[PDB]
Symmetry: C4
Subunit: 398 residues, 4 copies
């Protein structure tokens, strides 16, 4: 974090400049007691080119704002049209904005941070415009307080497109300035309106995407006027998904990363099911790499028929959270309850037999769907695991 302090310091110094130079263009009486601050600021502004690790079509602003055009124009008392060149330090704003965009810790939303940057920019521009309006005013015997408060109030009035009209321009040189910043205020307010209009669907993107996905389903299903119990259980499933995965589907996000990053993410996510399954306890460094990407999580409600008897289902379902009970062919007797760690349906592919009994969940079971092809591949590739699987299968037969 040796660069976070430096970046904070550079942001503070560039903000100090952007606040300070116009305020002394209007008020030449300043700049006399603030010389050490300006000296330190100039030193910091020149001392960032070697610390940021030459001329570029995009890295020019750094040198354009490091040159000491300040502390010289006031010193020689140049005329205002010629002393206006001191505003070059305002070009450092682009560089500090880019730097703050390239460094983060919270990972702020790009649209919300863009709106924050626009808020900062419009506040800074409001201060600059207020100072400018104050500059071309008739001389008066007023304190700088009320004289600046009135100017800032007028600038915020025009840039907000409110326009009370209590104070208005009265000279042509003021009228041209009023027109220019009226147009700029229209543009800036338009940019802000567009920024909120875009941002309303950018913050907590999952929280809005899940809501929009649920809304259409609920509307159509309520229009069909289906049984309210089904409504209740569907809404319960959807809010449980909201609580567990935050309205996510894994393939919605992992289908962009390349293969090794995808493998690493899958391992760091499914280390749990790697750690609790009996035959996966140190089964192999490679085997987990082949299998971990294929397990597709499935979610079932409290009492739903997982697999009915007589079916030709050839897929093994693992358990990550929940208890599962199996009901035999007499639909009265249950063999046992299968909590986390075990699975069911093993005697479907190896044994080439139909579903011996109906299996149903209890409250909410997090499963792991595995396709028959992957199961066949791992059985034909790893023999000890196939031997163990047949061992538990023949044990469950007894």
């Amino acid at each position: 974090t040796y660069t976070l302090v430096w970046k904070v310091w550079i942001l503070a110094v560039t903000l100090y400049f952007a606040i300070r130079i116009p305020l002394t263009l209007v008020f030449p009486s300043l700049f006399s007691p603030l010389l050490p601050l300006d000296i330190l600021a100039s030193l910091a502004l020149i001392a960032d080119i070697p610390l940021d690790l030459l001329l570029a079509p995009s890295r020019l602003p750094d040198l354009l704002a490091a040159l000491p055009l300040d502390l010289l124009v006031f010193a020689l008392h140049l005329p205002s049209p010629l002393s206006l060149l001191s505003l070059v330090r305002l070009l450092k704003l682009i560089s500090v904005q880019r730097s703050a965009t390239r460094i983060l810790s919270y990972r702020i939303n790009p649209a919300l941070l863009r709106l924050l940057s626009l808020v900062g920019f419009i506040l800074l521009a409001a201060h600059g415009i207020a100072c400018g309006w104050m500059s071309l005013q008739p001389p008066s015997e007023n304190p700088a307080g009320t004289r600046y408060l009135s100017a800032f109030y007028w600038t915020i009035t025009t840039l907000t497109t409110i326009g009370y009209g209590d104070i208005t321009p009265s000279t042509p040189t003021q009228t041209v300035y009023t027109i220019v910043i009226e147009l700029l205020g229209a543009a800036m307010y338009g940019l802000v309106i567009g920024n909120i209009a875009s941002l309303v669907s950018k913050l907590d993107a999952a929280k809005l995407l899940h809501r929009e996905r649920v809304e259409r389903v609920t509307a159509f299903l309520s229009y069909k006027r289906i049984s309210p119990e089904l409504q209740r259980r569907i809404i319960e499933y959807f809010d449980y998904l909201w609580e567990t995965r935050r309205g996510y589907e894994e393939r919605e996000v992992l289908k962009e990363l390349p293969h090794p990053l995808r493998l690493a993410v899958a391992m760091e996510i499914h280390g749990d099911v790697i750690e609790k399954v009996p035959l996966f306890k140190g089964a192999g460094e490679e085997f987990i790499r082949d299998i971990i990407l294929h397990l597709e999580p499935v979610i079932y409600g409290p009492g739903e028929y997982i697999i009915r008897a007589g079916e030709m289902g050839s897929d093994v379902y693992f358990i990550n959270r929940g208890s599962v009970e199996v009901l035999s062919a007499d639909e009265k007797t249950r063999y046992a309850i299968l909590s986390e760690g075990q699975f069911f349906g093993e005697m479907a592919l190896i044994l080439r037999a139909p579903r011996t009994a109906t299996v149903r969940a209890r409250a909410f079971c997090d499963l792991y769907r595995l396709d028959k092809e992957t199961f066949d591949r791992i059985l034909s590739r790893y023999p000890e695991i196939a031997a163990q699987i047949q061992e538990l299968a023949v044990r469950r037969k007894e």
Copy 2:
């Protein structure tokens, strides 16, 4: 509904507070005759933590607004900067908004309800800002009526970005407040503009999606300048779809729910075709589970050629609404008219024969497309149903 009344009561009491505290900050003469209401309100505010079924990073506002900072600041007559702490009750707004978001009966559109919440929030903020503006006003001998009406009129003027300018700030302490709420009014108006700009395509989402889908097809087809009779029949089909399914495709909505919820929804929707088809009358608890998801509804116009003679079509079409006639190879003689309940094309897969005669609808027939693979699977899985199907096939031969 024992919680709906409680939630309505909590909304009413928090709205009463949000309206009441600032109005007595400006007017200390109140709070003397409204003590029982405040006592009951305080009791209700503390009596919701055990009735909502500890400290949390998101459940803090409940305790922050339950603490009785009210009925004490006015009692001891604290100074205004120190008595300003009584506004903590306004944090209950977040909790009541969240609660109202989590409970519904009409299933209001999230964007429209968000706009309603924003309307309520901006009205409440307008009242608060009006009371605040009234607070820092010069003392005058005016009734509280006109004195509050003028303040609210001014607040609604600034927050709407209209600014007539009949009444304007005249002191620096008023000018700073004017600037602050000018910025807040810009932000709030921007939020409202974004909310309507988003909401214009959120209410009755089907009614707009269907319109947008129809518009491009109609525009292109009219550009091609094809025969107007085809225009008329296409538009008739589209409006019939609007009337029947409200511009919906089943797979557009069912492709997100898991398998058992999808099965349950399919049964609750297609119980009709389950109930009228002759061989589906109590055919089996399981068989309907296998078949009901695959029947794809198809819609044909008044006179369209369903299946022409000589084709190798191997799909059975059911009937849900409408009459279908079959024209023989002499294109003059019709065998009969097939109303709801029966089907056609059975002697295509079992008999391995081509289409014996042309079949056409009459006005608008709702069919049920079934693929050859599913038909083969059910024939090879259920034998009595295959026997019955061959029975009606050989009967129709005679």
Copy 3:
């Protein structure tokens, strides 16, 4: 068009009412010389229930606006709060808007027509609000002209959120009205802003979709800095597509219509290629139905290698516009030029031989891609066509 005149008449009469009733609420001196117009209007308003081919949750406004509450309140000179009931005729606006939405000849864009309806509604509301503001004004000796022009000017000032402030409310009963229509003006201006913000990408949807599709390709390809000749020819192809199909892909629009409408549209579009190809001149009523949906149009530039020698291409390319030349294995000698009507590549599937010579277009050739599977199916289904195709193939061998 016997209903277009009736709908125009009903729109005219409801607009006349919506303009007329408030203007006589403010001005009671009217309604004396306009009795025949009101009588005819009332007759027309009651005489539409049997001509529109009972009580409904959505068809209530028709009866609510047909009842003659007008011509009675002015007759008995009811008090203003009680005579305010005459505004029920304004509910006919919903019905006329719905009717105009359900009938069209130009097929106006739904968003642009929605904006036109909103423009009409806001103008009508501006007139109503101006009349209302005029109602609660102090009595004065002014002509109704200037007295209404000032009121309408004020109403358009507030609803536009401009607020000059030359004329402002001065009584509490006026101030409440000012606040109410200030809020309504905010809402209406927000709706208008959202409507344009949505409409900017709704008019001539093809003209914008094609532009957006071309822009990304051009930007990326220019970024790669590839040879400018390729830029020129790619842009030429894209503008030719703009001129010919208006930036369309057939499957983008036909993938929503059902099978028979799709067949009919395909026939009405490809009757040209049906009419010019030698072996398609009355080939068969059914054969065109099987083939016409599969021909995929392909577009090639001036000189592009259609099919090179030595390839295993097994697809027949038809010609709809353009000349095609074939270059032999000596890359100097051309057999002929193939204009519209014929095809090439026939001796690829029947003969099971590789591409005998290279074939290239001349300026811009509109082809018709046909897959090998469909060609095989039609050859194995229709024998005379296969005989003819082999006849031209063996002829081209000689």
Copy 4:
């Protein structure tokens, strides 16, 4: 570029007209010393019909603006309602806008250029409206400077919806004009708001699409709270993609161009890998055409396991940038480092053998994924290349 100068000249002359005619409608004293400019302008306006390579429903404005209605109305001193016809030259604006839309060199963004055109149009309309407002003003002894500056200031006030209210209409003929341009200002400001609201996501579309794609992945992955080293390497991969391909996937853009343009683009992009690979140095004109479209670039991090031992991988990976090392079965000894130019995994399909050793990258390797099917096709189609590949394979065995 013989037409760029002509188009610039026509834009300049039409802008000069649009600025000039209303300014002399208000000020008849002009048009006396500017006759040569108007003569040259008229000549240029008539001399563009034969230089643009008759009557059309869309090409009418050219003739409507070429006719010399100017230099005649002022000459005969027609009355203002009758001399108002001179504004026909403003219809040339549509044609110049269309022409500038059809010709470009920078390939400006259509939305940003549309906003620039709207800015130009609203500025021109502001000038026209200011001149119009100046026209119907009471006569006064004021210089044309202040008299026009005030009018333009007022016009920019109304069209920005600010409305200070320092200068307001005072006559009914002025009030009607004020209402008309108030409505027009509402419409124009709405259009501008919509244009920025759309443009915020149109400039540098790749720069925003890549950011939005990265944001959701980063948010979800940080929510899972996976190991920060994986965060660092994933972010490094994403920024490297930003630097190399600018956040692009080739199939995202090439899946719209037809086959020959796609082939040409692929050759112009992959001429590098064509030029450096040993066996691709002039391998064949056709072979590169078959292979160049299939090579899919893959990117791996510094140390990632490319292909582990014991796998059945049958795909050859080429090298475009980076060094690759292979670790043997003793996981301590490396055979060599494979820099750009060579490949690995050749002895996987020809030899029908499993992966002899583990292969890993070093810093960041740009590969070229080739499917087994394409490799088999080229081996069975080109025999010398297969002989050479087997030669290097058997050499690498030794």
